[PDB]
Amino acid sequence: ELKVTQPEKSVSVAAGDSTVLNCTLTSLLPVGPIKWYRGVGQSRLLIYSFTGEHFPRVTNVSDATKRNNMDFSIRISNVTPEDAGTYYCVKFQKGPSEPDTEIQSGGGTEVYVL
């Protein structure tokens, strides 16, 4: 079962402090990007992309850098008031052609800047 897990909570951070937003997956299949968004709607802002392999042209290449291969956490350094909002870690399938197709999402983590 593919699930994307983010902590269910609110982190409150002073402007200028940093925070890490956690996201883990139960599977790396099917292949495709994990992208982070802030906010709501079709114009949700893209924040960070774990793009990964050039699939399906390549099907056998993976990231060899992680402490844990199911982790997709991001660090927001020196948070600003503009960074307040709910962040979503979203899993896509990289199909034959673009755009990528969303298939799963975490439930969101709120950042409140004090």
Resolution as reported, in Å:
1.4
* Token pair of 5 as six digits: 């897990």
Q: Which CATH architecture has domain 3-114?
A: Sandwich (2.60)
CA distances from 23 to 12, 35, 65 (A): 18, 11, 16
* Domain layout of the chain by residue ranges: 3-114
Closest CA to 109 of 89, 80, 79, 83: 89
Specify whether the CB–CB gap between 25 and 72 falls below 8 A: yes
CA distance 19 to 113: 11
| Half-sphere exposure of residue 92: CA atoms within 13 angstroms, side-chain side | 21
Burial status of residue 31 (CB atoms within 10 A of its CB: 0-12, 13-18, 19 or more)? middle
Pairing, β 24-25 against β 74-76: unpaired
Length of the chain: 114
- Measured CA angle at 33 (ends 96, 108), to 5 deg: 135
CA distance 4 to 89: 7
Q: Tell me, what amino acid is at 107?
A: G
Method: X-ray
